[PDB]
Ligand binder design. Structure first.
Ligand SMILES: CC(=O)N[C@@H]1[C@@H](O)[C@H](O[C@@H]2O[C@H](CO)[C@H](O)[C@H](O[C@]3(C(=O)O)C[C@H](O)[C@@H](NC(C)=O)[C@H]([C@H](O)[C@H](O)CO)O3)[C@H]2O)[C@@H](CO)O[C@H]1O
Ligand SMILES: CC(=O)N[C@@H]1[C@@H](O)[C@H](O[C@@H]2O[C@H](CO)[C@H](O)[C@H](O[C@]3(C(=O)O)C[C@H](O)[C@@H](NC(C)=O)[C@H]([C@H](O)[C@H](O)CO)O3)[C@H]2O)[C@@H](CO)O[C@H]1O
Ligand SMILES: CC(=O)N[C@@H]1[C@@H](O)[C@H](O[C@@H]2O[C@H](CO)[C@H](O)[C@H](O[C@]3(C(=O)O)C[C@H](O)[C@@H](NC(C)=O)[C@H]([C@H](O)[C@H](O)CO)O3)[C@H]2O)[C@@H](CO)O[C@H]1O
Lengths: 420, 170, 420, 170, 170, 420
């Protein structure tokens, strides 16, 4: 029931091992091991058959075969209902007492969800057959008084260690485009007309490791970038992008909100493959994808969506609702102060956030024939309660970086309060 | 006695627990003998082919009624039976003495009871093959052995008996 | 060669485990385990085949298939020539010496006998394949001088612990009748005409736990009662006797002797099933089986055949030969003193036994509208040598209970010596 | 970086060593749970049927080129694959605590590299199924676990990586 | 010598005992190498298919005569051969040294002898496959080994030889 | 590269166990065993297939099937490419560190050679699949710096203990003759005409254990005798030689050199079978094989080829090149001093050897109606450097025995230097 700081799409969540049904529905058996004796229960795989458990909220789309396909994209699981993996338990009873050995079949719980705007619209649970659980304890007394006990509720209980590993997968209904050649310092990609019919992903790699600015020529629509998990250090070609059809993706930064005018600043390594998801462009005018390697401390924004703020030439509150980054991650805002530029002319501002807490950093963006450069103007250790005002040169451009420290809500609200 | 339950009137399916051994079947699988610090091991495989259920139906509760009602609340032994499971026991014989151990199958006792006035009116019984249990005894050609070691005259549980129920509907 | 205190019929005797043939005919092999090394011999059941050994004195009737059927009735053995049960032996040799590990196949010896009047007229021995025997010892010297030794006699030797468990089975050639409804406090069963052609068993259960008097309306023929082993606490119906086709029977009390005019007094539990064996009634007059729950200390005779003594109105010895109960069990005798009843009128008697020894108890049987009642008149700690006389009221009825303490002969002889 | 080799110009076949585990396949085979001094055992059989190679070809080096060139200098995994080989791991759970171990396949990493100016220009990769590896962790329903214990995001070697080469000819 | 028996004139069937190893077949099954405290295990299955008897008939005693006469008094190896039996040996290599062990089949030696004047005139020999035996030796590339460790030139018994007879009739 | 003191023919040499190929071509796998954990690698023979390695210098004759046939004659190996023999390794890691477990397949190296006059003209190497090798050590560091290392040379390395067991086999292209009846004290065998076409072997056994003189009636051609390994104490018939078709032969003594006029003196045991190899007699005159049991200390020459020396009636050196016996073995020379016999008449001699070193013994051969008799005249502890002269009675016969103590060359040169 917690917040999921991820963009719209499909995710496979490994919710842990040791899952089993109630009422001993997965009990293999119990051995009474007398003192100075050893007992053992074995799953020898004399038959490789296993029985997975499946549960879906939408049988039509999220069918078992479909869910299995997702699990394959996420963790690359090959075998779903067979196993050659053996598991056995051995226990010796002490000289003084008798031991009870119970063994149960278990499952790893994989959750498939269709996450849309901070909400789960579809969901399936796939219980992958696991390698069992064994409980040993002092043998109960054959005379222990029998207690009428009502059966528990039908369901699952978790027996293994706490685990919750989220893995995003390429949405199988959105096509994949590919920039064959490693992108140089500058590059422009023309978004195919297919973008009019549905979102797509653009697979690529950079020739040189560094920080990059990526965006559409009008900072619209917003872009999202992912890393192809496990893509690093495999097949490689200096003059060509070797594909691994890796459908497992790690969200770096980006947003889904329609009016989030912005561009991305991320750190890219040449030995890895990345995916940029371009939303559906419902227009007849060809859009573009511009890539540019950045030199300089613009890298301070490394892995962040820089939201360009609009409608500033007014007084009072200036709210901007955006999907909140996860605790520890960034989200930036770019401000070009209303008015013309002459050092002296300024305007008073008070930066603040509303849903989530974080650490702010105010930068003064500057230009040079050697790229950009940020000058730290001030830092904020409390944005949710900031009241300290700051005067900014009119006609100048500032970038405010927020590091989330508390994820209370799906959206993080930024307030660029204007005092004058 | 054994028919006094504190349950409303109706039909229930009860899990009497794992660990049940059957009457006089004690030595059907055979016994093992060893000595002088040797380790003895006996095991098995309750392959569907062998390990078969024991039904004791009544008028109100026939075999099918018993099965479906049990596999509905508790472990589905019909499916599980297709997957071979093994178990073994080992024990070291004493330095200068002989050891004898024999094996027998254990079961899970399931019951279908008809309750009326906090008393069981009818009772069906099912024994689903579980795993196994071994009994040991040290000996020599001179020792006389308590014959209860070799023979069990009334079904019983080697663990603590249970009573986990669920009222049947329809 | 000892006495078998059981009624005529079939019995399966488990004579123990560890049986094997002479001359190493069942030797699997020997391992020479050098010091600081471990050796192991295994029966992995890569093949489930086993080879039972059979021996019969009457191949026509006591055929192997027949014997196997009996073994099934007695112990419920399912598999006779197959096994999935593994057995393995492991032994580590010390650092100072070498160990010799010998492993042999073994068998459990089941004896099937047709027991008739203290005699075995038919017999078969079924050797059920068992789980082996392993002998470890200090490795013999490779130089040990060879000794010419003649082969032993063909046969079996017992290697396992002493065991002799007797189990009686329903005679398969005698039909089974069934009293469907749990018998109430009083009940009369009409013996079908089939009884003219051969003995039968009557399967039943009592609605109320207690002591019961059971007999034919003329105390003839004698009846025998058994318990259906393992019948308790299985399927049950208050208004109906649930059958388990249990052919394993435990002799409670009863006799075969033709002229043993008598009735039975036994303790019956409602949660169990019982069998009464009615002998062959070679007559055209319908016989009956009367059941009656008894209240009162008549229960002192609990599980006993009460033999009615006849031809008492004479002087001297009055012998009564009956099949002896086992050590610890009872056998009773009922006496109605010759002459009419008037307190004072008495007759001198000396109770004694001749073949087996036991403890006697003399009761005075009395009537009440609340059932019967026994009054202890005297006790005897030595019946085989008793000389103490006792005066009994003429026309009165006494019951003498004998508890066998020494089983020297198949029959126990009771002597109701009359002194006057 | 990872492309700087001290080799003359040409094509080489390299044995990167045994002991490689693949990205995010950590728990594909499942995990095992035990407690209170019980011994837990997990094993497998890399039967050709299951254990299948992972090819990552390039333009200059296709699957066949990779195979033949590897099986020519190093272990012929295609032949070996016809003979079943097993491996197991066992660990005893602590006295009053729970133990969790999960298994995953290990591999031998082979590479086909195109060298030019002491730098790798092209690189093909092959992962031949080797044996297996298990990770354990003690736990209770209260402990939070480092998620790196369960997930490996980038292929790596659990042993020391290697670089045993042989210049390819023709 | 070896032909002097204290038996009346006639034909006898003799059980020379279990534990016989055959000439020069020492290393036919192969050897095993291990080190530094590792435990090494070797075993087998004398499945009828493999383990086959060795007959050495004479004029008076042909193969059949030998078999029938042996299986009549002693263990019927022809029947027993249909049921697979296994055996293993294990040994731990020394802390900082190498261990070598090799396995070989053992047999039961049966003889059919023609006696005349307390002396054997004719002798047939049968070797029935029994189980197995292993020899170990610690070593290093520097040690020279007694070659008798690897080679047995004359059939012999690793246990004490026996002479259990029974005069044949007809 | 050392000297092989054996006669021409075929030999199978067991060159040891633990052979494996370079570059891990036989590596089964490596397990990383974490502390307080146990690891195991198993060859369960779920498939009985094994893959032998073969290498020959003459594919036409020394084909794999042929080599396998030889290996069968030598060691009686039955299975060449299948095994039911299991091998498994188990290792527990200490509490303080991690262990690395490497397991490799291995082979026993059997070498088949066609040995002709101190030279190997044909050769094949058969690598019999063995039971593996396991290396455990402290787990290497995952961070250990990677070292570019060039692949080793294609080939084999020996991992097992040092072993070199030579076994000769009957040359399969030379026929076997058989003397059915145990030879008595004297016996003459007529060599069949087949001897004109190729050498043959004559299989036989002596009725009485003792020393024997064996030769052709003209001490030409030279004879070679072998023992049929494992032939002792198997099937036996006092009146007949029981055959075991044993093709494994142990060289006792004998030579191949054409002009080695000689006879053999060897110790033969009746419980064993022997083979005498008669060279190809390219003549139309029937040759013979004479056997004679010798009584007396002629047995001092036990197992030795007695070379008759010719052309002695000259002065100076008298060289005789013969195939050298192995260290510890004998080779004798018979001398009949030139001139007529009269005690006083003598000639000075100096015995010496040239290639190999040894211990000499000079005997004076004498005749008796009780057989022969040797009288020790002198002994020599250094033949390669002897200068001590000795005077021998002319017309008398002496036998010089050499015990090789140093095998430097294939041939041992004997010099019967005449001083006068
Ligand atoms: C049925 C339907 O079409 N839905 C509309 C829904 O779109 C609309 O919501 C408003 O939509 C506008 C975009 O057109 C903005 O996104 C509004 O949100 C805010 C924000 O929170 O970010 C409000 C905020 O005041 C704005 N900031 C400033 C300085 O003006 C920002 C800003 O414009 C954007 O973030 C771009 O930078 O937008 C959002 O409420 C609602 C009207 O409430 O009506 C539905 O029918
Ligand atoms: C071929 C044949 O039919 N067999 C008979 C055989 O029956 C008969 O034996 C006698 O049979 C009578 C029954 O008719 C009795 O059973 C005799 O035994 C005794 C006994 O030991 O119990 C003798 C004893 O003296 C009797 N007691 C008294 C007080 O009379 C009891 C008594 O009658 C019964 O026990 C009933 O309560 O019977 C038994 O010897 C023999 C004759 O010896 O002849 C065969 O041919
Ligand atoms: C092509 C061909 O046919 N080869 C011949 C080759 O045979 C010949 O060698 C000589 O052959 C004679 C036999 O005819 C001898 O074997 C010679 O060897 C010696 C020896 O070393 O033993 C020489 C020695 O001097 C001889 N001793 C005496 C006392 O005379 C002995 C002796 O005769 C024999 O040992 C018999 O007892 O023989 C050997 O060199 C060569 C000639 O060198 O020519 C080839 O073409």
């Amino acid at each position: 029931q917690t917040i999921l700081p991820y963009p719209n799409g499909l995710y496979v969540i490994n919710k842990g091992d040791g899952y089993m049904r109630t009422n001993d529905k997965d009990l293999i058996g119990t051995l009474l091991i007398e003192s100075s004796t050893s007992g053992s229960i074995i799953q020898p795989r004399l038959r490789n058959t296993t029985r997975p458990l499946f549960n879906t909220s939408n049988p039509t789309i999220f069918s078992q075969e479909y869910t299995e396909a997702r699990l394959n994209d996420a963790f690359n699981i090959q075998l779903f209902n067979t196993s050659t993996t053996l598991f056995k338990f051995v226990e010796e009873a002490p000289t003084n007492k008798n031991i009870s050995m119970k063994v149960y079949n278990t499952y790893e719980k994989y959750e498939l969800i269709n996450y849309q705007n901070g909400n789960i619209d579809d969901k399936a649970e796939y219980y992958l057959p696991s390698l069992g659980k064994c409980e040993v304890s002092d043998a109960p007394s054959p005379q222990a008084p029998v207690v009428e006990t009502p059966v528990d509720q039908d369901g699952f209980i978790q027996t293994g260690p706490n685990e919750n590993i989220i893995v995003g997968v390429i949405n199988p209904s959105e096509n994949i485009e590919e920039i064959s050649t490693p992108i140089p310092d500058d590059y422009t990609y023309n978004i195919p007309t297919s973008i009019q019919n549905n979102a797509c992903y653009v697979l690529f790699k950079v020739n040189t490791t560094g920080v990059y600015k990526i965006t559409t020529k009008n900072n619209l629509p917003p872009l999202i970038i992912y890393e192809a998990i496990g893509s690093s250090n495999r097949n490689m070609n200096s003059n060509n992008l070797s594909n691994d059809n890796i459908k497992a993706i790690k969200y770096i930064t980006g947003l889904n909100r329609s009016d989030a005018k912005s561009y991305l600043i991320v750190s890219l390594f040449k030995d890895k493959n990345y995916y940029i998801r371009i939303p559906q462009i419902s227009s007849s005018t060809t859009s573009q994808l511009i890539f540019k390697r950045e030199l300089g401390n613009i890298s301070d924004l490394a892995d962040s969506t820089v939201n360009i703020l609009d409608n500033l030439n007014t007084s009072g509150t200036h709210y901007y609702t955006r999907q909140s980054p996860d605790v520890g991650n960034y989200i930036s805002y770019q401000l070009t102060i209303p008015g013309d530029f002459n050092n002296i002319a300024s305007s008073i501002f008070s930066f603040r956030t509303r849903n989530n807490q974080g650490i702010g950093t105010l930068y003064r963006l500057t230009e040079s024939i050697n790229g950009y450069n940020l000058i730290t103007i001030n830092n904020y250790s409390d944005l949710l309660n900031n009241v300290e005002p700051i005067s900014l040169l009119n006609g100048a451009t500032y970038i405010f970086r927020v590091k989330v420290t508390e994820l209370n809500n799906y959206n993080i609200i930024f307030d660029a309060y204007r005092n004058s | 006695s054994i028919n006094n339950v504190n349950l409303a009137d109706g039909n229930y399916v009860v899990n009497r627990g794992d660990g049940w051994i059957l009457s006089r079947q004690n030595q059907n699988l055979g016994g093992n003998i060893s000595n002088n610090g040797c380790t003895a091991i006996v095991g098995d495989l309750r392959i569907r082919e062998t390990a078969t259920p024991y039904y004791y139906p009544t008028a109100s509760f026939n075999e099918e009624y018993i099965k479906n009602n049990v596999q509905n609340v508790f472990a589905n032994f019909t499916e599980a039976s297709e997957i071979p499971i093994g178990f073994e026991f080992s024990k070291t014989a004493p330095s200068n003495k002989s050891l004898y151990m024999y094996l027998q199958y254990t079961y899970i006792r399931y019951e279908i009871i008809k309750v009326l006035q906090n008393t069981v009116t009818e009772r069906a019984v099912l024994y689903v093959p579980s795993l196994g249990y071994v009994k040991s005894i040290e000996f020599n050609s001179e020792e006389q052995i308590d014959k209860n070691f070799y023979f069990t005259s009334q079904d019983k549980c080697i663990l603590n008996e249970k009573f986990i129920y669920k009222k049947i509907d329809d």
